[PDB]
Enzyme design. Structure first.
Site, PDB file in Angstrom:
ATOM      1  N   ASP A 117       0.763  -1.248   0.000  1.00 54.96           N
ATOM      2  CA  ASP A 117       0.000   0.000   0.000  1.00 54.96           C
ATOM      3  C   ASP A 117       0.803   1.313   0.000  1.00 54.96           C
ATOM      4  O   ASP A 117       0.461   2.200  -0.786  1.00 54.96           O
ATOM      5  CB  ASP A 117      -0.967   0.009   1.197  1.00 54.96           C
ATOM      6  CG  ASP A 117      -1.906   1.197   1.220  1.00 54.96           C
ATOM      7  N   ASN A 119       0.547   3.387   2.472  1.00 55.21           N
ATOM      8  CA  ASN A 119      -0.515   4.194   3.104  1.00 55.21           C
ATOM      9  C   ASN A 119      -1.318   5.031   2.066  1.00 55.21           C
ATOM     10  O   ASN A 119      -1.841   6.101   2.400  1.00 55.21           O
ATOM     11  CB  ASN A 119       0.047   5.074   4.237  1.00 55.21           C
TER      12      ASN A 119
HETATM   13  N1  LIG Z   1      -2.841  -4.373  12.200  1.00 55.11           N
HETATM   14  C1  LIG Z   1      -3.280  -5.248  11.294  1.00 55.11           C
HETATM   15  N2  LIG Z   1      -4.236  -6.133  11.661  1.00 55.11           N
HETATM   16  C2  LIG Z   1      -4.677  -7.019  10.760  1.00 55.11           C
HETATM   17  N3  LIG Z   1      -4.297  -7.179   9.487  1.00 55.11           N
HETATM   18  C3  LIG Z   1      -3.347  -6.289   9.150  1.00 55.11           C
HETATM   19  C4  LIG Z   1      -2.801  -5.313   9.968  1.00 55.11           C
HETATM   20  N4  LIG Z   1      -1.854  -4.571   9.279  1.00 55.11           N
HETATM   21  C5  LIG Z   1      -1.844  -5.110   8.085  1.00 55.11           C
HETATM   22  N5  LIG Z   1      -2.716  -6.158   7.937  1.00 55.11           N
HETATM   23  C6  LIG Z   1      -2.905  -6.990   6.748  1.00 55.11           C
HETATM   24  O1  LIG Z   1      -1.764  -6.862   5.910  1.00 55.11           O
HETATM   25  C7  LIG Z   1      -2.174  -6.463   4.586  1.00 55.11           C
HETATM   26  C8  LIG Z   1      -1.116  -5.673   3.840  1.00 55.11           C
HETATM   27  S1  LIG Z   1      -0.991  -3.946   4.380  1.00 55.11           S
HETATM   28  C9  LIG Z   1      -2.016  -3.059   3.163  1.00 55.11           C
HETATM   29  C10 LIG Z   1      -2.843  -2.058   3.962  1.00 55.11           C
HETATM   30  C11 LIG Z   1      -4.024  -1.432   3.142  1.00 55.11           C
HETATM   31  N6  LIG Z   1      -4.136   0.019   3.281  1.00 55.11           N
HETATM   32  C12 LIG Z   1      -5.364  -2.118   3.523  1.00 55.11           C
HETATM   33  O2  LIG Z   1      -6.430  -1.498   3.097  1.00 55.11           O
HETATM   34  O3  LIG Z   1      -5.379  -3.174   4.185  1.00 55.11           O
HETATM   35  C13 LIG Z   1      -3.525  -5.792   4.787  1.00 55.11           C
HETATM   36  O4  LIG Z   1      -4.301  -5.783   3.595  1.00 55.11           O
HETATM   37  C14 LIG Z   1      -4.139  -6.626   5.909  1.00 55.11           C
HETATM   38  O5  LIG Z   1      -4.795  -7.797   5.427  1.00 55.11           O
END
Ligand SMILES: Nc1ncnc2c1ncn2[C@@H]1O[C@H](CSCC[C@H](N)C(=O)O)[C@@H](O)[C@H]1O
Length: 178
Positions: A117, A119
């Site tokens: 992503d 962000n």
């Molecule tokens: N704190 C968290 N709790 C649960 N799943 C998480 C997380 N941080 C990241 N992920 C997982 O890791 C993946 C890659 S991070 C991509 C983030 C994106 N903005 C989104 O809309 O999700 C995410 O899609 C999610 O499935």
């Protein structure tokens, strides 16, 4: 080694291919390779899935990892996870979900968004999960830790929790320190 596999299904949803540049696709491929290597070395390996396999990721995998079709203990499918898993069994893991995950249900299928992503697509996986009507939850990061983690970090935390059954210990072992 006599390995006892976990019944927990862990899916990397690769339906976001068009939202990433080739540089981020190569990063996702690298993270998927890490997930595969860690799952094969885990005490209780999960049922690993790679759904919506196509686009730039499939071509980058065909080019560099020619033996992905030979890969063992992984389900690489071109179909979307919705076409393969029951709606009631799914839990989409997302940092933007208000639901705090407390325990892992090994009868359920947990989904990780196959997205690097930076962000840019904030709340994307949470929006898609809520629209489809499937359950969603965030990792119980609490005060230990942007709380957005990399694809491989989330996958490795799930494997570490199935071994330790301690969330605090799982985050400490996997997450990199400043
Ligand atoms: N704190 C968290 N709790 C649960 N799943 C998480 C997380 N941080 C990241 N992920 C997982 O890791 C993946 C890659 S991070 C991509 C983030 C994106 N903005 C989104 O809309 O999700 C995410 O899609 C999610 O499935």
């Amino acid at each position: 080694r006599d390995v006892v596999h976990s019944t927990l299904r862990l899916i990397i949803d690769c339906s976001f291919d068009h939202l990433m540049v080739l540089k981020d696709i190569k990063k996702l491929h690298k993270q998927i390779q890490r997930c595969y290597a860690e799952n094969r070395r885990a005490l209780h390996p999960v049922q690993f899935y790679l759904t919506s396999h196509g686009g730039q990721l499939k071509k980058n995998m065909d080019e560099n990892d020619k033996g992905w079709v030979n890969w063992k203990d992984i389900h690489i499918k071109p179909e979307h996870y919705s076409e393969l898993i029951k709606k009631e069994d799914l839990i989409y893991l997302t940092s933007d979900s208000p639901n705090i995950l407390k325990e892992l249900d090994e009868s359920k299928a947990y989904v990780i968004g196959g997205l690097v992503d930076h962000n840019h697509h904030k709340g994307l996986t949470y929006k898609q999960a809520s629209d489809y009507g499937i359950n969603h939850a965030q990792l119980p990061l609490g005060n230990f830790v942007r709380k957005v983690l990399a694809v491989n970090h989330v996958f490795e935390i799930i494997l570490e929790y199935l071994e330790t059954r301690d969330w605090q210990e799982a985050f400490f072992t996997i997450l990199p320190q400043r």
